[PDB]
Design an enzyme around this catalytic site. Structure first.
Site, PDB file in Angstrom:
ATOM      1  N   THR A   1       1.232  -0.741  -0.327  1.00 59.00           N
ATOM      2  CA  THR A   1      -0.027   0.015   0.491  1.00 59.00           C
ATOM      3  C   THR A   1       0.599   1.329   0.562  1.00 59.00           C
ATOM      4  O   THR A   1       0.894   2.448  -1.024  1.00 59.00           O
ATOM      5  CB  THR A   1      -0.867   0.022   1.234  1.00 59.00           C
ATOM      6  N   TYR A   2       1.423   1.034   0.879  1.00 61.70           N
ATOM      7  CA  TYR A   2       2.808   2.207   1.024  1.00 61.70           C
ATOM      8  C   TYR A   2       4.005   2.712   0.938  1.00 61.70           C
ATOM      9  O   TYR A   2       4.712   3.424   1.222  1.00 61.70           O
ATOM     10  CB  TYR A   2       2.376   3.274   2.723  1.00 61.70           C
TER      11      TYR A   2
ATOM     12  N   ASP B   1      -9.898  -1.955   1.373  1.00 62.26           N
ATOM     13  CA  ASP B   1      -9.273  -1.852   0.197  1.00 62.26           C
ATOM     14  C   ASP B   1      -8.878  -3.960   0.146  1.00 62.26           C
ATOM     15  O   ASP B   1      -7.878  -4.491  -0.236  1.00 62.26           O
ATOM     16  CB  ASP B   1      -7.583  -1.510   0.228  1.00 62.26           C
TER      17      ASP B   1
ATOM     18  N   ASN C   1      -4.880  -8.885  -0.979  1.00 60.41           N
ATOM     19  CA  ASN C   1      -4.743  -8.990   0.389  1.00 60.41           C
ATOM     20  C   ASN C   1      -5.108  -9.626   0.919  1.00 60.41           C
ATOM     21  O   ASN C   1      -5.628  -9.464   2.250  1.00 60.41           O
ATOM     22  CB  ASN C   1      -5.060  -7.166   0.806  1.00 60.41           C
TER      23      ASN C   1
END
Ligand SMILES: N[C@H]1CC[C@H](Nc2nc(NCc3ccccc3)c3ncn(C4CCCC4)c3n2)CC1
EC number: 2.7.11.22
Length: 275
Positions: free
Chosen positions: A14-15, A118, A123
């Site tokens: 994600t980040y 999300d 995931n």
């Protein structure tokens, strides 16, 4: 760091990036997420969020600027598994076991007012034992699993966005083709409207007042569920349509879904996977 040997990059999170690594001292294989004060905070609740269906956040080494997250290491993610089962498809009993566990995880973090935001095949992680775990929570990106209220500008959406995303995942495991493979927000929305019918105040009170609703959207009829999710039986469809209701308030909760007659015969078979 320094106690970890980056064995191999295994993805783009994600980040931040995610690597498979050995705890240079322990000897145990683990998963690292490297990323770019309010934060540390939301991360705290994460370490004390233990459930058999949520990836285990092991440690959080915050060492000057760069912030690492150490998770338990899982065998494989769901996209790959699905990809690998495309010719035969995933057997119903397994599709059923997974949905059940996932709903158990969702029920759990929704209890703690924590939403995923999300949810997707990438995931979701699995192991040789037959368990599936929710991974990489929230705070060329994919939009196929986006709830309609998020696409319409609702800024304070609820835990119902997760049920929607799971709803989409459910369908994809049964038919083997994404339910709403949009390529832009308006495209995403129109694919949704062309299948479930364009929402109006009748089925979605307040829909017409949403930030991004345009009185000019085309007006599509709602398609028969017999056509959308064909191989799925009638119990499966009841549930699917209840997870796909436009109105977040009438959309079924994780708790209730667990009591749906669709799960009466749920068993826990093991998957056959190539690691
Ligand atoms: N948005 C997504 C980006 C990629 C990330 N991938 C990813 N893959 C894993 N295992 C897969 C695997 C197995 C064998 C070889 C190569 C890869 C894994 N295990 C724990 N994590 C966590 C670290 C984060 C929490 C889960 C993992 N994240 C998951 C999130």
């Amino acid at each position: 760091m320094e106690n970890f040997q980056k064995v191999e990059k295994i993805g783009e999170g994600t980040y931040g990036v995610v690597y498979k690594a050995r705890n240079k001292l322990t000897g145990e294989v683990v998963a690292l997420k490297k990323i770019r004060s309010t934060a540390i905070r939301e991360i705290s609740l994460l370490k004390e969020l233990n459930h058999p269906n949520i990836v285990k956040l092991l440690d959080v080494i915050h060492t000057e600027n760069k912030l690492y997250l150490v998770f338990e290491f899982l065998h494989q993610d769901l996209k790959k598994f699905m990809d690998a089962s495309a010719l035969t498809g995933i057997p119903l009993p397994l599709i059923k076991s997974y949905l059940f566990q996932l709903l158990q995880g969702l029920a759990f973090c929704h209890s703690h007012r924590v939403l995923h935001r999300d949810l997707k095949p990438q995931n979701l992680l699995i192991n040789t034992e037959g368990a599936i775990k929710l991974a990489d929570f929230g705070l060329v990106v994919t939009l196929w699993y986006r709830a309609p209220e998020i696409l319409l500008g609702c800024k304070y959406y609820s835990t119902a966005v997760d049920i929607w995303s799971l709803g989409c995942i459910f369908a994809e495991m049964v038919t083997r083709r994404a339910l709403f493979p949009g390529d832009s927000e308006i495209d995403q929305l129109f694919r949704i409207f062309r299948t479930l019918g364009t929402p109006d105040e009748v089925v979605w009170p307040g829909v017409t007042s949403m930030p991004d609703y345009k009185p000019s959207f085309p007006k599509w009829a709602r398609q028969d569920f017999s056509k959308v999710v064909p191989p799925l039986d009638e119990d499966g469809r009841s549930l699917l349509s209840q997870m796909l209701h436009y109105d977040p308030n009438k959309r079924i909760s994780a708790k209730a879904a667990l009591a749906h007659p669709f799960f009466q015969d749920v068993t826990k078979p093991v998957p056959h996977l190539r690691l």
